[PDB]
Amino acid sequence: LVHVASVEKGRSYEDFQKVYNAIALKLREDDEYDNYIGYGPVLVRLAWHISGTWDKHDNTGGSYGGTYRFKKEFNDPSNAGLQNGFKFLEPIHKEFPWISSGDLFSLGGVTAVQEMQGPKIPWRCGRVDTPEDTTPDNGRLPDADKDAGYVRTFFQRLNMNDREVVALMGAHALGKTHLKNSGYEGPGGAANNVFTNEFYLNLLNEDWKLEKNDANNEQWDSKSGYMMLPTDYSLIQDPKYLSIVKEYANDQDKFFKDFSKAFEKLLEDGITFPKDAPSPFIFKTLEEQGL
Ligand code: HEM
Ligand SMILES: Nc1cccc(N)n1
């Protein structure tokens, strides 16, 4: 199955920077969301979940088709809570009806990371909306009550290696888990709407205790009020993952560079870019634009 990137008719860098700006401005405006965490975190999760349905074996799923807009995927139990991100992007899509859903969902994630002071994430346009019959079935996203072995195997389907997996998980420093959405409760750190390498520092420096939350699920909690999912904790349980966790905890720049590459790769999995397609766009933040 092949998905060839097709640039929205006549659009260029400037058009997409305008969409980015609209998203960034709304992020700044609607600051009260989720007890003032803002929509940054949920937008990053949305971009990851619409991309995380991909299967390298047959190229089903993936961000290309923007299938999250269809009820089967929209209602995936694994996507509980993402409706908030979708609603946030609705007015954006209304103003820029020309951008495809896949491009909008993925751009939302890139915009969020950058506006939260994270690394620059090159982004490519061209995803094209596909029929409702192309929507992937539920169950392709990962479980959180598993171990390192599960995590490693799961991500091989997304063509991600150990380093890429550990780097991507760093996004768990963002936002929080919500009991009503996933059966887990609590943030991973203190700075939950600013993109940093705090995820790794906390895994290594906090004293975690295996407890049961009000949904009767086990999770690791610290006195500081932070939490880690069993899958997050597996990163310091597995010796190979542990080495990488230590690396990122001690090199903020390295983490930023590796996360950027892995996140762009995640958002582009399944897409074939023509040799003459535009080069990846690197959008300026509102701050860099003096906006
Ligand atoms: C091992 C794979 C993964 C597991 C099992 C997992 C599990 C979870 C769970 C259970 C939540 C809480 C949802 C809620 O209650 O609202 C969550 C939130 C989150 N996830 Fe992951 N996740 C994984 C991978 C990733 C990756 C690769 C990224 C992005 C690079 C990511 C980004 C996020 C973000 C930003 C949030 C917070 C969302 C919010 O605050 O609304 N996760 N994840
Ligand atoms: N904020 C957050 C989201 C998912 C997992 C963790 N540990 N923390």
Bound compounds, each kind once, are:
protoporphyrin IX containing FE, pyridine-2,6-diamine
CATH fold-level topology of the largest domain: Peroxidase, domain 1
- CATH C-level class of the largest domain is Mainly Alpha
Helix/strand order, N-terminal first? EHHHHHHHHEHEHEEEHHHEH
Task: Let me know the number of strands.
Answer: 7
What structural class do the secondary elements suggest?
mainly alpha
Strand order of the largest sheet: 4-5-6
Distance between the termini: 42 Å
Profile the largest sheet.
Answer: 3 strands, antiparallel
Please tell me how large the radius of gyration is.
Answer: 18 Å
Helix content: 40-55%
- Provide a count of the helices: 14
Site (Transition state stabilizer): 45
Subcellular location: Mitochondrion matrix; Mitochondrion intermembrane space
Family: Belongs to the peroxidase family. Cytochrome c peroxidase subfamily.
Organism: Saccharomyces cerevisiae (strain ATCC 204508 / S288c) (Baker's yeast)
Q: What this model shows, in words?
A:
Keywords: Heme, Hydrogen peroxide, Iron, Metal-binding, Mitochondrion, Organic radical, Oxidoreductase, Peroxidase, Phosphoprotein, Transit peptide. It is found in: Mitochondrion matrix; Mitochondrion intermembrane space. The active site is at 49 (proton acceptor), 188 (tryptophan radical intermediate). Belongs to the peroxidase family. Cytochrome c peroxidase subfamily. This protein is mostly helical. It folds into two domains: 1-141 and 263-291, Orthogonal Bundle (Peroxidase, domain 1); 142-262, Peroxidase, domain 2 (Orthogonal Bundle), CATH 1.10.420.10. It is 46% helix and 6% strand. It has helices at 13-29, 33-36, 40-51, 71-74, 83-95, 101-115, 148-156, 162-169, 179-182, 198-205, 230-237, 239-249, 252-268, 286-289, and strands at 3-4, 176-177, 186-187, 209-212, 218-221, 227-228, 271-272. A hairpin with a 5-residue loop joins β5 (218-221) and β6 (227-228). It is globular. The structure holds protoporphyrin IX containing FE and pyridine-2,6-diamine. Residues 172, 174-177, 187-188, 227-229, 232 line the site of pyridine-2,6-diamine.
